[PDB]
Amino acid sequence: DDFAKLEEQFDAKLGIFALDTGTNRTVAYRPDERFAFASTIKALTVGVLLQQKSIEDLNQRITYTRDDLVNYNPITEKHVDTGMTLKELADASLRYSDNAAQNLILKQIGGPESLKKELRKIGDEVTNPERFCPELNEVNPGETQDTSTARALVTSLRAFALEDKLPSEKRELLIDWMKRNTTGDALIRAGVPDGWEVADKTGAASYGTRNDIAIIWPPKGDPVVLAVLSSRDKKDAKYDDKLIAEATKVVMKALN
C-alpha cells in the first residue's frame, strides 16, 4: 500500500521480497513477478566462482585484450597490459559492476548454461541465465530469459552469503566485496539508518529496469535479506533510484 503509492509516484512496477533471518518475518509485494535481473546476477556469479575454486585458486592471472572488453569496463580497461587475477576480477565485477570482469568470470565457470546448472543445483529453479554482458538486459515483457524474481534472488543470495552453499572464508570474501560496493549509495543504502551495515549489488536494464539486492545487518540481531526490483513500461524508460530508497524505507518500517 505504501508500495502501491510508490508505483503510482514513479509510474513503475515494483517487486519486493524481504526476509528477516532472525524471526522469519517476511514483506512481500509482487514477490513472484519476473524482472530482468540485470547486474544483480554478478553477485550469484561470484557465488558460483567461489564454490568452484579454493581461495588460493583466485590468484590465477587472467590475460585479455580490448577485444574481451565490452560496453562498460571501469577497472578492466586499466589492466589490459598485465591482466587481472580472478580475485581482482570478482572485486571489479561486484564493486564497480564491471561488465568485462563479469564476462571473463562467466567464461571461467563455463558460460550462462553452466551458471544456470549451478543455480539449479543450489535450489534455484527460477533464475534464468541465458546471455553474456550486456545482451542479457534486453528483455521485453513476457519473456523469461535473463529474469528472476525478488523471492528467488533473496533465497539464492542468502544461500551463498549466509547459509551453506559456501564455507565461511568464502562467505566472508563475498560479503566483504558486497559491503564495499561503490554503485549503491542512492538505493537500498539510502533507505536504511546509518550504522546499519549493507552488502549490496545493483542492476539496471531496458524498460527502466532498476534493481538492488542486499543483505542488511541492524546493530541489534540477525540480518535481513532484501530484493527491490522495478521496471516500466516504455523500453527507453528512465528509472529513479529514489523509488528503491523509498521502497527500502517502507520494508524496514514493516519489519521494525
Ligand X SMILES: O=C(O)c1cc(N2C(=O)C=CC2=O)ccc1-c1c2ccc(=O)cc-2oc2cc(O)ccc12
Residue 78 is labelled as binding a ligand:
no
The cell for 157 is 543470495
Residue 184 is labelled as binding a ligand:
no
Q: Give the shortest CB-42-to-ligand X separation in angstroms.
A: 6
Residues with Cβ within 8 Å of residue 110, at least 6 apart in sequence:
none
The cell for 86 is 580472478
Site string for ligand X, 173-212 (x = CB under 6 A): ------------------------------xxxx------
Cα R_g (the chain), whole angstroms? 17
Query: 39, 93, 156, 230: which is the annotated catalytic residue?
Result: 39
Q: Give the N- to C-terminal CA distance of the chain in Å, as an integer.
A: 17
Residue among 50, 58, 136, 159 that touches ligand X (CB under 6 A): 136
The reply on whether position 85 binds ligand X by CB under 6 A is: no
E-strand ranges in the chain read 13-20, 26-29, 35-36, 61-62, 84-85, 147-148, 197-205, 209-217, 224-231
Task: Pick the closer one to ligand X by CB: 203 or 223.
Answer: 203
The reply on whether position 133 binds ligand X by CB under 6 A is: yes
The reply on whether position 72 binds ligand X by CB under 6 A is: yes
CA distance 103 to 60: 16
Q: Give the shortest CB-153-to-ligand X separation in angstroms.
A: 13
Q: Give the shortest CB-99-to-ligand X separation in angstroms.
A: 5
Q: Which residues are annotated as a binding site for substrate?
A: 201-203
List the catalytic residues. 39, 135
